[PDB]
Amino acid sequence: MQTIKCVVVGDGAVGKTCLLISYTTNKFPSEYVPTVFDNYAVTVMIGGEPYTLGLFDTAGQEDYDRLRPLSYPQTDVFLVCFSVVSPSSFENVKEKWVPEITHHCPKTPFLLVGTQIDLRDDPSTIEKLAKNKQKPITPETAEKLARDLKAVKYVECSALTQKGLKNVFDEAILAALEPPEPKKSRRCVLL
Amino acid sequence: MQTIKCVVVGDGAVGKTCLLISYTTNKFPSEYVPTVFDNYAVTVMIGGEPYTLGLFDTAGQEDYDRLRPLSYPQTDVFLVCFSVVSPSSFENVKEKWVPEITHHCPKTPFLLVGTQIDLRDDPSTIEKLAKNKQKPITPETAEKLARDLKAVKYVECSALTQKGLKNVFDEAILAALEP
Amino acid sequence: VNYQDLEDNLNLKGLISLEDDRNANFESNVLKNEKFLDEAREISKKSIPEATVKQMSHLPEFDDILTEGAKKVESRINKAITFRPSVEEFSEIQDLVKTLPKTKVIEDLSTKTNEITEALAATSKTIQRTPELKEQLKTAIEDFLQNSQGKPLTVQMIENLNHGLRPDEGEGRLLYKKENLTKENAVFSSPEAAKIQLAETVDFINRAKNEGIEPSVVGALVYQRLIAYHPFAEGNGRMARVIVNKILLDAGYPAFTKFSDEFEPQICPQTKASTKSATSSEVVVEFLKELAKKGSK
Amino acid sequence: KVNYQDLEDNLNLKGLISLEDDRNANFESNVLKNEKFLDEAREISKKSIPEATVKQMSHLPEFDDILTEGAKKVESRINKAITFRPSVEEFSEIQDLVKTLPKTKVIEDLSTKTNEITEALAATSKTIQRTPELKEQLKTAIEDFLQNSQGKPLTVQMIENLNHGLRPDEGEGRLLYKKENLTKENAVFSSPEAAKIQLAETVDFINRAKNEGIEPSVVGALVYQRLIAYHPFAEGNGRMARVIVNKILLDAGYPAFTKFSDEFEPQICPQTKASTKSATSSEVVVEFLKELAKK
Numbered sequence: 001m002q003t004i005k006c007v008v009v010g011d012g013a014v015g016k017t018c019l020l021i022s023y024t025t026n027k028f029p030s031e032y033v034p035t036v037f038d039n040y041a042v043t044v045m046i047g048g049e050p051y052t053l054g055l056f057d058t059a060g061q062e063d064y065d066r067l068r069p070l071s072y073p074q075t076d077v078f079l080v081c082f083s084v085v086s087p088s089s090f091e092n093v094k095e096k097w098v099p100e101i102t103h104h105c106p107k108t109p110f111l112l113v114g115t116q117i118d119l120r121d122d123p124s125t126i127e128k129l130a131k132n133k134q135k136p137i138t139p140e141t142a143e144k145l146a147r148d149l150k151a152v153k154y155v156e157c158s159a160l161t162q163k164g165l166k167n168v169f170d171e172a173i174l175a176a177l178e179p180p181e182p183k184k185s186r187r188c189v190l191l
Numbered sequence: 192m193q194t195i196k197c198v199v200v201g202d203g204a205v206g207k208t209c210l211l212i213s214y215t216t217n218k219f220p221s222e223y224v225p226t227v228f229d230n231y232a233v234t235v236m237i238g239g240e241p242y243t244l245g246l247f248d249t250a251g252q253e254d255y256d257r258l259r260p261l262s263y264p265q266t267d268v269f270l271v272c273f274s275v276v277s278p279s280s281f282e283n284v285k286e287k288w289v290p291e292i293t294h295h296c297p298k299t300p301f302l303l304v305g306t307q308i309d310l311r312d313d314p315s316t317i318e319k320l321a322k323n324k325q326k327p328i329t330p331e332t333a334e335k336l337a338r339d340l341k342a343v344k345y346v347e348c349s350a351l352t353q354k355g356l357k358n359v360f361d362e363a364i365l366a367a368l369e370p
Numbered sequence: 371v372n373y374q375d376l377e378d379n380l381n382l383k384g385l386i387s388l389e390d391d392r393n394a395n396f397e398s399n400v401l402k403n404e405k406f407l408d409e410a411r412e413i414s415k416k417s418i419p420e421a422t423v424k425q426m427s428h429l430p431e432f433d434d435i436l437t438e439g440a441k442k443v444e445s446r447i448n449k450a451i452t453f454r455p456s457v458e459e460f461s462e463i464q465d466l467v468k469t470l471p472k473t474k475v476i477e478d479l480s481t482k483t484n485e486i487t488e489a490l491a492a493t494s495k496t497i498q499r500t501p502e503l504k505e506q507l508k509t510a511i512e513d514f515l516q517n518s519q520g521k522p523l524t525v526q527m528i529e530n531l532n533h534g535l536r537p538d539e540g541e542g543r544l545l546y547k548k549e550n551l552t553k554e555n556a557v558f559s560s561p562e563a564a565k566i567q568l569a570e571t572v573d574f575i576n577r578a579k580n581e582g583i584e585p586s587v588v589g590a591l592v593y594q595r596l597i598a599y600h601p602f603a604e605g606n607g608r609m610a611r612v613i614v615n616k617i618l619l620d621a622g623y624p625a626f627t628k629f630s631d632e633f634e635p636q637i638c639p640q641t642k643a644s645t646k647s648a649t650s651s652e653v654v655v656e657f658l659k660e661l662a663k664k665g666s667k
Numbered sequence: 668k669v670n671y672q673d674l675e676d677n678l679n680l681k682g683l684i685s686l687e688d689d690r691n692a693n694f695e696s697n698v699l700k701n702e703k704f705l706d707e708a709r710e711i712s713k714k715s716i717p718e719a720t721v722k723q724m725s726h727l728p729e730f731d732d733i734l735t736e737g738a739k740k741v742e743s744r745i746n747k748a749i750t751f752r753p754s755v756e757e758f759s760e761i762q763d764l765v766k767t768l769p770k771t772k773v774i775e776d777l778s779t780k781t782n783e784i785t786e787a788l789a790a791t792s793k794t795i796q797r798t799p800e801l802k803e804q805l806k807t808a809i810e811d812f813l814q815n816s817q818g819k820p821l822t823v824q825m826i827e828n829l830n831h832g833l834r835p836d837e838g839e840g841r842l843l844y845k846k847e848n849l850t851k852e853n854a855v856f857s858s859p860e861a862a863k864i865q866l867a868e869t870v871d872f873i874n875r876a877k878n879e880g881i882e883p884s885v886v887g888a889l890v891y892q893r894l895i896a897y898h899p900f901a902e903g904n905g906r907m908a909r910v911i912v913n914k915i916l917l918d919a920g921y922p923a924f925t926k927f928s929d930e931f932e933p934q935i936c937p938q939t940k941a942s943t944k945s946a947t948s949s950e951v952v953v954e955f956l957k958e959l960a961k962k
């Protein structure tokens with residue numbers, strides 16, 4: 001039986017751990033999540049047949065830049081996440097995340113995943129973004145970056161309301177069935 | 192989709208952890224083994240359909256008598272293990288282990304699994320048992336004990352040589368799928 | 371780095387000297403502590419495939435990869451909590467303490483128990499709506515004040531206190547956290563580093579009392595780092611407020627409730643880099659201001 | 668208990684017994700009631716319990732004792748095996764046995780002690796003999812340990828370095844301490860946290876025993892037994908214990924220790940097969956001195 005290893009990357013605090021917990025437990029975690037979601041395996045049904053879906057969370061923080069790629073080997077699909085109400089996390093998709101997974105996993109498909117849809121209509125969130133002369137990322141804006149960065153497609157979800165959450169991993173499984181190729185640890189020797 | 196929980200019980204030092212490691216890694220552990228094998232899941236293809244096989248080790252020591260049955264819920268098949276060169280562990284199958292799983296899981300099938308086959312013909316092992324006026328457990332003796340205690344069947348394996356090891360977990364899956 | 375010429379009637383200089391000694395030993399006591407490192411090694415390897423682990427084990431840099439992130443986080447936290455104010459902040463803390471109300475007569479144990487219970491009640495709507503929970507927390511506060519009266523504080527006292535402040539949990543719950551947790555966007559110490567620096571905070575509390583260091587400033591620093599360390603699985607907020615309020619009430623200061631909603635997320639270093647985090651001295655200033663704000667009410 | 672007030676003692680065994688009585692009397696607080704120890708038992712136990720059963724059992728007050736009972740009974744079993752409390756007959760026998768040990772007046776230098784401990788390890792394993800490079804690497808760790816521990820109180824960090832130095836064939840990134848309870852030929856070892864707790868007690872025991880002038884050959888015997896029984900590290904516990912004990916012996920002028928007889932080694936630790944008679948703390952000392960007197 002074929003297994004599907006799905007690795008979730010993206011800036012810190014974009015909701016990677018929460019979207020995994022809300023998807024695997026059907027409950028948005030209330031009060032305090034682990035830094036990295038404990039890697040979990042679920043049997044998803046696609047085409048009438050079972051697939052083992054392996055979900056792997058990562059620490060997006062800069063402090064884990066050396067350790068994080070060691071989880072990338074034998075990855076079938078990446079979820080490059082950004083918060084639709086965090087323009088910096090969106091910028092880091094082009095500036096950091098897509099270059100990272102492309103370096104270690106050149107021929108591995110990835111999806112652009114906009115997280116925290118619900119906050120896009122939150123007045124307090126809109127107000128805070130406006131303070132910095134910023135505004136949420138529209139779906140049209142993210143869809144263009146997905147084509148520019150050769151992403152499979154742009155999907156969107158809200159871990160809190162589960163809106164489109166099931167659809168995100170459905171597209172991740174479909175992208176994973178596009179045959180990929182193995183990964184590299186870059187092999188950056190020191191000293 | 193469908194998962195099969197197989198719990199391995201039996202006296203301490205009969206080889207539960209080793210038979211689990213030897214079956215999952217195809218290599219008998221030579222180093223110090225863990226007290227309880229870390230619970231392990233494999234998707235087996237034996238038969239026509241895939242099934243997720245959950246292997247669960249237990250602490251056979253008397254000190255864990257209160258904690259051990261808390262692992263029994265949702266069990267599909269038990270492996271009551273004894274060492275065929277340990278008459279006391281064979282006796283504890285009737286005296287402790289079968290009564291224990293029957294008390295917590297009355298309608299759950301179990302297999303009588305004789306462990307450490309390779310020692311049945313070991314002269315030093317036979318000589319040691321003969322000093323205590325004991326002898327290894329023959330398959331006929333265990334087969335009788337399995338039928339008396341309403342076991343599904345008696346199987347035996349050696350984690351060291353892997354003889355009959357793959358068959359032990361095959362029969363446990365068959366026993367769970369067809370009670 | 372020099373404070374020799376500044377007015378000091380709070381023993382802040384002696385406080386800064388404690389922080390300098392603890393800071394100078396932070397690398398050995400935490401970053402070079404093998405229990406801490408072993409924790410980081412095991413947690414990091416859980417996300418790495420076993421084929422990659424066997425491959426990387428032949429590279430001498432592998433151990434530094436497993437532990438670099440964990441060490442940087444603790445260093446980030448230690449930088450946020452280490453008290454090392456500027457010459458301006460030093461004199462500012464001097465003026466701010468003079469604005470605090472301080473009662474001459476120190477309350478008895480029964481009275482301190484009620485006031486610390488009410489301070490927790492003001493923070494939580496659940497404690498107000500649940501009389502049974504408030505009475506349970508009142509007993510834990512009373513037990514902690516009885517065992518710590520006239521006796522040096524110990525981690526066992528804090529373990530019992532934290533357990534007492536978690537009566538709604540259910541049996542069999544781990545006392546300490548089993549993994550690194552994140553609060554909103556904040557980072558906390560690893561479970562082992564939190565245990566290590568929990569005991570250092572206990573030592574810090576005892577030495578500060580013996581050295582006669584200003585209790586209100588002590589309470590501020592203790593509040594920040596306990597929250598930043600987050601040693602326990604649950605009840606770290608309650609526990610921190612009870613310990614701090616004992617330090618304050620023992621000195622005659624009003625009990626502390628909570629910082630402003632705008633200022634709380636600045637106590638810890640964060641995962642979202644856009645959030646400006648407050649320095650240890652800035653936390654002390656806002657703490658003293660909040661404490662003086664309760665003298666107006 | 669048993670009275671020692673009237674017995675001849677030129678080894679400070681009375682002081683040794685008093686040290687063990689204090690440690691044993693605080694064993695319950697220092698280990699069994701230690702929350703880091705209980706938390707470890709709680710988390711390991713729950714790993715095997717279905718989440719539905721945990722939620723049900725969290726409503727029963729006895730649940731926490733069920734999670735930790737097994738771990739507590741194992742440590743108590745181990746502490747009972749290592750706690751030194753001899754009978755009046757064993758007391759007097761140890762006194763006579765120490766007088767039969769060879770003791771050189773001139774104590775060897777640092778370089779000589781390094782070589783003798785290296786050879787003592789070589790005799791135990793056939794692997795170190797057939798591999799000169801491995802033997803040279805262990806010689807460096809012993810030298811480093813003897814240099815950092817000369818004339819200074821022993822510390823857990825010194826042992827951590829020593830243990831790491833005695834594990835040169837491991838590969839990078841390996842955990843120093845063990846991550847779970849291990850069993851060796853049906854023997855029981857301390858949990859990882861309880862082994863750390865009691866490793867530190869053994870270090871304090873070594874330093875206190877040297878200050879109180881307690882007979883080093885008896886100290887080394889007890890230290891060998893509990894270090895092996897505790898088994899704190901993932902690997903190299905055997906090599907590490909032999910190095911620490913031989914240091915205690917060579918610092919006193921006694922020959923280095925190698926290993927017990929093949930028939931007696933499995934009796935040091937409590938067993939998983941209850942039919943195996945386990946040796947008491949005093950019996951381990953008696954056998955240790957007898958093996959040392961032969962050398």
Ligand SMILES: Nc1nc2c(ncn2[C@@H]2O[C@H](COP(=O)(O)OP(=O)(O)O)[C@@H](O)[C@H]2O)c(=O)[nH]1
Nearest residue numbers: 011012013014015016017018116158159160554
């Ligand atoms: N409103 C909203 N908040 C979210 C959502 N997903 C995550 N969050 C919040 O974002 C913060 C950080 O989330 P986290 O899972 O730790 O993100 P990570 O650092 O990338 O793993 C937490 O406070 C969550 O409550 C969402 O779908 N909607």
Ligand SMILES: Nc1nc2c(ncn2[C@@H]2O[C@H](COP(=O)(O)OP(=O)(O)O)[C@@H](O)[C@H]2O)c(=O)[nH]1
Nearest residue numbers: 203204205206207208209224307349350351852
């Ligand atoms: N010769 C032989 N020895 C075995 C076999 N299985 C286990 N052992 C040994 O029996 C001892 C106990 O094994 P273990 O797995 O720990 O038993 P457990 O306590 O039931 O888990 C170990 O020393 C093993 O090396 C076997 O099939 N053959």
